[PDB]
């Protein structure tokens, strides 16, 4: 009775284990800091109790005496995937398994 949907069952196994892999391998969010900055590797641990993040840029001084500021940047980046299309695909697989088995 299920002999002919075993292909679809394998496909559902794969389409689920690869999302478990995506969930397990990548990092959900990170603070991203950019720029020529001194970051104390110990102060970064206080990141959870911090309220103000202050980034002071490097001031480069030219041989001709001109002063100019490096770029500094800060923000959170987060892991994301195509939920709409993977859910539509796994919904279709599940629906087809139930349809063909009645």
């Amino acid at each position: 009775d299920y002999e002919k949907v075993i292909t679809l069952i394998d496909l559902y196994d794969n389409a689920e284990s690869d999302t478990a892999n995506y969930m397990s391998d990548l990092n959900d969010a990170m603070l991203l800091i950019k720029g020529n900055l001194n970051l104390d590797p110990v102060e970064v641990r206080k990141q959870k109790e911090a309220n103000v993040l202050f980034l002071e840029p490097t001031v480069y001084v030219d041989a001709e005496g001109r002063e100019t500021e490096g770029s500094v940047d800060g923000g959170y980046i987060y892991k994301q995937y195509d939920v709409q299309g993977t859910e539509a695909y796994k919904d279709r697989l599940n629906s087809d398994i139930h349809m063909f088995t009645n």
Partner: peptide, 20 residues
Amino acid sequence: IIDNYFNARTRTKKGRAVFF
């Protein structure tokens, strides 16, 4: 030379990231 002594010359100062 006298002016260079009185003014000196600034040098590249590296930035800081602080979480307070």
